[PDB]
Amino acid sequence: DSKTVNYFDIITIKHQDTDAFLHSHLARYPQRYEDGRISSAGQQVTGYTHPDFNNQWEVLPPHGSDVGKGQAVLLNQHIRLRHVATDTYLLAHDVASPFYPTNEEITTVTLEEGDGELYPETLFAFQPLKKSDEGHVLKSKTVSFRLFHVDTSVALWTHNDELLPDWGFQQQEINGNKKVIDPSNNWVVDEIV
Amino acid sequence: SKTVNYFDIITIKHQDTDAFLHSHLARYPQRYEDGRISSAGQQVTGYTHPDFNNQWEVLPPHGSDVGKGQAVLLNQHIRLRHVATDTYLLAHDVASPFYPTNEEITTVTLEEGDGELYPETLFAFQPLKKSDEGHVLKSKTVSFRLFHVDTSVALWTHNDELLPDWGFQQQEINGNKKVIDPSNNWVVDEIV
Amino acid sequence: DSKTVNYFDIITIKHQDTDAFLHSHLARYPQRYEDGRISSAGQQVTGYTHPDFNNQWEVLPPHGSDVGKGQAVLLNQHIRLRHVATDTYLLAHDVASPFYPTNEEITTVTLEEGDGELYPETLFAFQPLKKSDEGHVLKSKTVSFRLFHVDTSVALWTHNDELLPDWGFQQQEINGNKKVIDPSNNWVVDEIV
Amino acid sequence: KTSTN
Amino acid sequence: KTST
Amino acid sequence: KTSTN
Numbered sequence: 001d002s003k004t005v006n007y008f009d010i011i012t013i014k015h016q017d018t019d020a021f022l023h024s025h026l027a028r029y030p031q032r033y034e035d036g037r038i039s040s041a042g043q044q045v046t047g048y049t050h051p052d053f054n055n056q057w058e059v060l061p062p063h064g065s066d067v068g069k070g071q072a073v074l075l076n077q078h079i080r081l082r083h084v085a086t087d088t089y090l091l092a093h094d095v096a097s098p099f100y101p102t103n104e105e106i107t108t109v110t111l112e113e114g115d116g117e118l119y120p121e122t123l124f125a126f127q128p129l130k131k132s133d134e135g136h137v138l139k140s141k142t143v144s145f146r147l148f149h150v151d152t153s154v155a156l157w158t159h160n161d162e163l164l165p166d167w168g169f170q171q172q173e174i175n176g177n178k179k180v181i182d183p184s185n186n187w188v189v190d191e192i193v
Numbered sequence: 194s195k196t197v198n199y200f201d202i203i204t205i206k207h208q209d210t211d212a213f214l215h216s217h218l219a220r221y222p223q224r225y226e227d228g229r230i231s232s233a234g235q236q237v238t239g240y241t242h243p244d245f246n247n248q249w250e251v252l253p254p255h256g257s258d259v260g261k262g263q264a265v266l267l268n269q270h271i272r273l274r275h276v277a278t279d280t281y282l283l284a285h286d287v288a289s290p291f292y293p294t295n296e297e298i299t300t301v302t303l304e305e306g307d308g309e310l311y312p313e314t315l316f317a318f319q320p321l322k323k324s325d326e327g328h329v330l331k332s333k334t335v336s337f338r339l340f341h342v343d344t345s346v347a348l349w350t351h352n353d354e355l356l357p358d359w360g361f362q363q364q365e366i367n368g369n370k371k372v373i374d375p376s377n378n379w380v381v382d383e384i385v
Numbered sequence: 386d387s388k389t390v391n392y393f394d395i396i397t398i399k400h401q402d403t404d405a406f407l408h409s410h411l412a413r414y415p416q417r418y419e420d421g422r423i424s425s426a427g428q429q430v431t432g433y434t435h436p437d438f439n440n441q442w443e444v445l446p447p448h449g450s451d452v453g454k455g456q457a458v459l460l461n462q463h464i465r466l467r468h469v470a471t472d473t474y475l476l477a478h479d480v481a482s483p484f485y486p487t488n489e490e491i492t493t494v495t496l497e498e499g500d501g502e503l504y505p506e507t508l509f510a511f512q513p514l515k516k517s518d519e520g521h522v523l524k525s526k527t528v529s530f531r532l533f534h535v536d537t538s539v540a541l542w543t544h545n546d547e548l549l550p551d552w553g554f555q556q557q558e559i560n561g562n563k564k565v566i567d568p569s570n571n572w573v574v575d576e577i578v
Numbered sequence: 579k580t581s582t583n
Numbered sequence: 584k585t586s587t
Numbered sequence: 588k589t590s591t592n
Contacts, residue, residue, distance in 0.1 A: 422580040423579035423580045424579070424580070425579070479581050479582055480579065480580065480581065480582070481580045481581065481582045481583070482582075486580075486582065486583060487582055487583065488582065489582055563582075
């Protein structure tokens with residue numbers, strides 16, 4: 001409750017069960033996994049347990065919004081998340097994730113990639129755990145939510161029973177879970193920077 | 194069934210659609226698809242789920258001989274403060290989202306609502322029969338119209354067409370200039 | 386691939402004769418039908434032929450069950466179905482349906498109503514086609530059933546010879562068929578999500 | 579409101 | 584702006 | 588390239 005999150009705020013986003021932050025960096029998924037599956041070779045999105053500049057995300061409105069400074073983000077509004085350190089937009093799509101062929105790969109894309117043909121795939125919602133809470137204010141620390149992908153209806157998920165390989169620096173895998181109702185899909189806004 | 198007293202917090206439920214009078218920080222779009230211009234004010238909607246944002250505090254008018262812990266009587270003037278956003282319910286001669294002839298329902302800040310716009314924040318729990326004037330307002334068992342004093346409209350809602358995405362597909366609320374209509378009927382569902 | 390359906394799984398449910406999915410959305414039944422009958426004005430339940438997030442239902446146990454994860458749903462056990470996208474409970478009741486005055490309206494209700502005064506009307510059963518399959522584990526794809534409403538003894542039914550009007554987006558009508566033992570009442574679990 | 583029949 |  | 592499944 002510490003504070004209300006407004007559009008264009010910079011935030012950190014923390015997983016409740018593992019305490020890992022939603023994280024990104026310049027490293028890319030390997031073109032192929034050991035089982036032969038093909039990734040997008042896109043920018044990695046991971047779970048990182050330590051405070052870091054690369055945990056910062058800017059919350060943005062959809063195209064054609066007319067939103068300005070000082071306006072609260074509400075639960076279940078469509079939003080976009082820009083990775084501050086690399087200036088890329090979060091995206092999910094129907095590509096098998098590193099460890100779970102049934103779950104979706106999560107990546108980021110450049111401003112140009114994200115504002116053109118792929119724009120619809122950059123839309124998320126802070127989805128309330130109880131749908132009756134839609135339209136309530138997003139606040140730091142005290143409001144749990146699912147990071148829900150509008151286009152494919154997955155919730156972002158992570159775990160720490162198995163960590164990524166050396167190419168992922170033993171960070172937590174992040175992927176899109178098609179089973180939306182799962183406590184391991186729950187996140188909070190940890191702080192407003 | 195219990196008496197509604199001034200400064201009680203209540204939820205207000207539409208008889209025909211079961212929707213609760215609801216608000217949240219989202220605003221009306223500046224322009225609707227047909228080109229009409231709204232006030233860009235805070236949204237007021239009908240919401241079918243029980244929720245904190247359905248809560249309104251019933252308040253007396255500014256210089257009233259009614260006080261806290263005293264019953265609301267039918268056709269007395271009241272004000273409704275949205276608890277979750279701390280704003281005052283208001284209606285005015287602005288075309289509503291879906292009905293050019295019906296009035297937009299919004300909420301305003303305490304400063305606006307206690308200042309120049311105050312007269313527009315006054316409502317009444319209007320009895321369906323004028324002879325029930327002065328009867329005690331009770332939850333569940335007393336039907337009424339939510340009547341806007343300054344423009345003489347009754348708050349109305351419907352569920353055949355839902356709001357666009359900027360309103361989370363909730364129900365439109367607006368001011369009906371045809372006051373005697375069963376679709377203008379509401380009850381107090383619960384006292385919090 | 387056939388898999389066991391457990392309590393708290395999310396499933397899609399597909400009608401054998403029309404291939405339509407059990408579906409819901411925020412749109413409501415009209416207060417009155419053209420012939421003047423009055424509906425509940427409740428949330429619509431329809432048959433939808435395309436994959437969609439709004440085809441998803443959570444299978445839940447009855448009140449006071451104490452069932453947890455990893456427990457199989459058995460044929461003819463009492464169950465409840467919560468619509469994932471709108472967070473409401475499936476319900477049937479003695480209200481005439483859109484197209485069939487003799488058949489019952491199928492709707493969803495809020496969690497508060499469905500766990501309160503309307504709770505008895507939210508109980509269904511995966512009724513086996515053969516009574517000798519009572520108590521057998523429910524499997525995706527390979528086990529056909531009727532979706533039986535406990536309180537009024539109807540089975541959910543749909544058809545595609547005539548579709549709902551524009552207010553139902555030309556989706557299929559779903560209603561409660563009082564003739565329970567009839568193959569047009571057959572459904573399967575298509576997927577565990 | 580209207581019952582089946 | 585637009586009156587009812 | 589590889590879709591989910």
